[PDB]
Structure 1
Amino acid sequence: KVRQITDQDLAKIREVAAREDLYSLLARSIAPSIYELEDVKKGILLQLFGGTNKTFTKGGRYRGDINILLCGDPSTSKSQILQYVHKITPRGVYTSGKGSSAVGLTAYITRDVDTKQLVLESGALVLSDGGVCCIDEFDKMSDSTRSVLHEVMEQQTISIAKAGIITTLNARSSILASANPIGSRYNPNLPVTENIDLPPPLLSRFDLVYLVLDKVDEKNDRELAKHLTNLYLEDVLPVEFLTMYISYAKEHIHPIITEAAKTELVRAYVGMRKTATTRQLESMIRLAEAHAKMKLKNVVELEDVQEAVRLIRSAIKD
């Protein structure tokens, strides 16, 4: 042309996991080119692990995927961020939402070209099962196909009933999306709803929403231009350790919750309720259990819930 990790790999994974600050190192590794924007990288690093997934008989399956929406001024670097997270994840798809078929992300019964026969072809959400699916140009996605994502983010299954075939597939994926506003700037005075041109439920169901802002600041502008030119000037980042660590954490590790998380979580939610919907607490639990999967552990404690609440309240600050 053009898995089965060894014991030495296990040992090096353990000793690296024994690092004092594993959070910041892979915070900076995922996007070496991106300068600042450390908080969105924190969120993406937490997303790439995901909270534990469970399906008990009585209540049913409870989701364990984290959804993130990036939006803001039109000339930031969100697309490069998405193309960065595309490569790290094991199984994922990077397709823009500008056009294509209304079921282009799900199954589409099509006539076979080579033979006059019938073939069932899955879409991009089914093909990102168990991973992270990146959507680009979220604002151009059509009103009729949007509803498809609605059943994906709610029941995590897609049903097709055409040409005598009635069946259901499995989505179980995570949505990271990037959007653009109407106009050349996101004026803070007007609220989010008018600018982003997205239905309130669709924006609401996203676990984390980040606003990227671009203000004319002499310090920030000079610092950005400096490192950009330094990159153009010709003169702590692991290469593939991330993929193996991600696979190890996703395929073997399953954390649990203890009463130490109970005590902090209940009072934190109540204090946030001193307009936080019940979605907020299930968002904190997922983020805390995903942080617990990092700094390799088998149970949650105070540090994970503190980091989760800090992240979800810094999200509120914007």
Structure 2
Amino acid sequence: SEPLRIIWGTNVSIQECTTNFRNFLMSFKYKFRKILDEREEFINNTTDEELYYIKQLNEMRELGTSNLNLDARNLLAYKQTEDLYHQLLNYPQEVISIMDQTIKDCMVSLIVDNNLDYDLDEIETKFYKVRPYNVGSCKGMRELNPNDIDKLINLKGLVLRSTPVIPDMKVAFFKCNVCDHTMAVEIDRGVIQEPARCERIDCNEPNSMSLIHNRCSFADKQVIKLQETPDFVPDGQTPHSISLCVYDELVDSCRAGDRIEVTGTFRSIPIRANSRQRVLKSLYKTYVDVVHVKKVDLAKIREVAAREDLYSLLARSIAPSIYELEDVKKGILLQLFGGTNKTFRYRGDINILLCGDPSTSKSQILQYVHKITPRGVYTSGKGSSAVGLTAYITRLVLESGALVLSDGGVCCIDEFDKMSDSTRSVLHEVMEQQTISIAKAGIITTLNARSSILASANPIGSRYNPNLPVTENIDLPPPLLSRFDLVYLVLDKVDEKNDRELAKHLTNLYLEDVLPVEFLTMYISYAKEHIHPIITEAAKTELVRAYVGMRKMTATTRQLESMIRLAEAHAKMKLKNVVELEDVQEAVRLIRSAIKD
């Protein structure tokens, strides 16, 4: 007696699918998911009786936002919806459209059933999307086969590049040449359903409608190239790749170099032999049409900031695996904090170098600060394993080097003695001006590098000679060496009272399981976010008398500027908003140790 709305080719009723989804999208409780998964005894009513997707839709509607994330296992946890999971996997676009429409209907019905007043016109105007994810096993890109050609799949891989956003027409806009009447036409399966005659019966001219391109409505499309991860490849051949299409607010979900998951329908389409013909090649382009993407506190901060031993505590915590080099550790901690910037340029960078014998802990020290710092890099003074120090013009494009890439982070450079001369010259304007000047291919700019450098350098030959000065042992020239705030020597000279305890400390790491090593990054982050020290007036006189003292003892104003920056860094430590006399005194003292080399 009535028509039926059926998912084509399946005999699934769309009313049944709709209500099966509705009765989960409302009245599901998160406790059921722990029944499906392992560790079911961790169910807890005071956290798990929540109407999980009512909670999601409420926060979502208070944010007015269109998208819902949906772990597909939650369908299998709920009795009226376990079949909907199979329909979702096997017939995804229809089921997903049904789920989208159901989310919009839930939003509409909530503001009249839960009946709090809201802009019904806003919800009416808005589109809504489900993002199903964790659909199933992350089957290999190399394992896909033509049975997948309409199923919802899951992939993992590496983003190589993405197009700019591509406008994709959703509604064509037509205008009549004779009578200027206008009509909107939805694009159906990518085809413009052109009106052959003008709509208005009082005009009805044939072939008179014309497309007004910049009055059409466009969705956003983007194409991204995903390479097979080397974890999955067989050893003797190239990795594969798959192009994936991604739309609207999922555009620019990822960038070049991102390792990601995607959940998406595997799709295929024919391609033409030549554009002037309908003739199609007998095997289709394949792509995945994605619906979800994913990559790969203050109380304690203030509590720890009250401590008296904080300087030593934090300094030892940067590398507790390494035997005692404690003034180096203190210097590198102060480098992590850094000074302050000013408008007028003078900036907050602090720069450190380690020299002495090659076969010693300095490399591990650079590695540890690299692991700690938010956005630093590790490199060495010459060559390029597809990563190099200086900015460089190549094909035409400008590439930014490791110094420039380390903007706002510590740049760790090993083999700093063996650095090439053009690089040795280039370091001057980042040391002084924190920038590098580019003047080629019609582009002129001072490309701002804004990086603190931790250098690791070596003597000539196998051993450092401490009876000779640093300039006599090291290759790199004094005017560059002068720019470093703190400069250190680490030596392998035999002493059992050091070597035995080093060996016992080292060997004990294989047996054993205060050291806030994981809280260190959070402390550094909140300090850099919140604290901007200013110099006390008494600290002016302290800086002046200390500088004239070391001047009476070959100093330069670069040492005074260094003492300022170190004192400001010392004031970020302890979360102090104004540089104290003790901050100046420790900056002075540590520099007095360093300048004696």
Compute the TM-score of the two structures, normalised by the length of structure 1.
0.89
Which residue does 2:337 correspond to in 1? 49
* TM-aligned CA distance change 1:4 to 1:305, over 3 Å: farther
User: CA 1:230–1:240 in structure 2 vs 1: closer, same or farther (change >3 Å)?
Assistant: closer
Contact 2:362 2:456 in 1 (8 A): yes
Once the two structures are TM-superposed, the CA of residue 233 in structure 1 deviates from its matched residue by 4.0
Q: Mark the runs of 5 or more structure 2 residues left unpaired by the alignment.
A: 1-289
Q: 1:237 to 1:267 in 2, by over 3 A?
A: same
Question: 1:183, CA displacement in angstroms?
Answer: 2.1
Change (3 A) 1:7 1:110: closer
Q: Is the 8 A contact 1:288 1:308 kept in 2?
A: yes
Structure 1 residues 9 and 103, CA, compared in 2 at 3 Å: closer, same or farther?
A: closer
Q: Deviations over 1:200-244 (max 9, x none)?
A: 101111111111123221211211122222223467222432212
Q: 1:300, CA displacement in angstroms?
A: 1.1
| C-alpha deviation, 1:162, in angstroms | 2.3
In the alignment, structure 1 residue 92 sits paired with structure 2 residue 376 = yes
- Provide the secondary structure at the position in 2 that maps to 1:284: helix
- The 3 A distance-change label for structure 1 pair 234 and 153 is closer
Whether contact under 8 Å (1:139, 1:180) holds in the other structure is: yes
Structure 1, 81-90 or 267-276: larger mean CA deviation: 267-276
Does 2:531 align with 1:216? no
> More displaced, 41-50 or 298-307?
298-307
Q: 1:143 to 1:21 in 2, by over 3 A?
A: same
Counterpart check, 1:295 vs 2:578: no
User: Whose RCO is larger (CA < 8 A, sep 6+)?
Assistant: 1
Distance of 1:3 and 1:46 partners within structure 2: 46
Matched-pair identity in %:
98
Closer/same/farther in 2, CA of residues 106 and 4 from structure 1, 3 Å limit? farther
Output one character per residue of 1:139-193: Cα deviation in whole Å (capped at 9) or x when no partner.
Answer: 1111122211112112111222223332331111111100111122221222211
SS of equivalent to 1:28: helix
8 Å Cα contact 2:355-2:490 kept in structure 1: yes
**Does the CA-based 8 Å contact 2:536-2:578 persist in structure 1?**
yes
Structure having the larger proportion of residues in helix: 1
Distance in 1 between residues matched to 2:446 and 2:292, nearest whole Å: 32
C-alpha separation between the residues in 2 aligned to 1:317 and 1:223?
27
Q: Is residue 102–residue 142 contact of structure 1 (8 Å, CA) maintained in 2?
A: no
Partners of 1:121 and 1:67 in 2: CA distance: 24
Aligned length: 307
Distance in 2, matches of 1:97 and 1:278, equals 28
Shift of 1:72: 0.4
3-state SS of paired residue (1:48) = helix
The whole-number CA distance in structure 2 between the counterparts of 1:241 and 1:235 is 18
Query: Which consecutive unaligned segments of at least 5 residues does structure 1 have?
Result: 112-117
Does the C-alpha gap of structure 1 residues 207 and 288 become closer, same or farther in structure 2, counting only changes over 3 Å?
same
Residue 257 of structure 1 and its aligned partner are, at CA, apart by 0.8
Counterparts in 2 of 1:239 and 1:221: CA distance versus 1, 3 Å: closer
1:65-119 C-alpha deviation (Å, 9 max, x unpaired): 11101000222110000000001111111011132399932332322xxxxxx33
2: distance between equivalents of 1:309 and 1:140?
A: 31
Larger relative strand fraction: 2
Cα pair 1:135 1:177 within 8 Å, conserved:
yes
Deviates more, 1:228-237 or 1:176-185: 228-237
Contact kept, 8 Å, 1:261 with 1:302, in 2: the verdict is: yes
Larger radius of gyration, structure 1 or 2?
Answer: 2
- CA deviation after TM superposition for structure 1 residue 55, in Å: 2.1
Distance 2:511 2:479 in 1: 46
Deviations 1:39-83 (A, max 9, x none): 100000000010111122xxxx21321110100022211000000
* 2:328 aligned partner: 40
Query: Residues 247 and 234 (structure 1 numbering): CA distance in 2 closer, same or farther, change over 3 Å?
Result: closer
State the Cα distance separating 1:120 from its structure 2 match: 3.1
Aligned CA distance change for structure 1 residues 6 and 166 (closer, same or farther; 3 Å):
closer
Instruction: Judge conservation of contact 2:534–2:579 (CA < 8 Å) in 1.
Output: yes
1:92–1:131 contact (8 Å) kept in structure 2 = yes
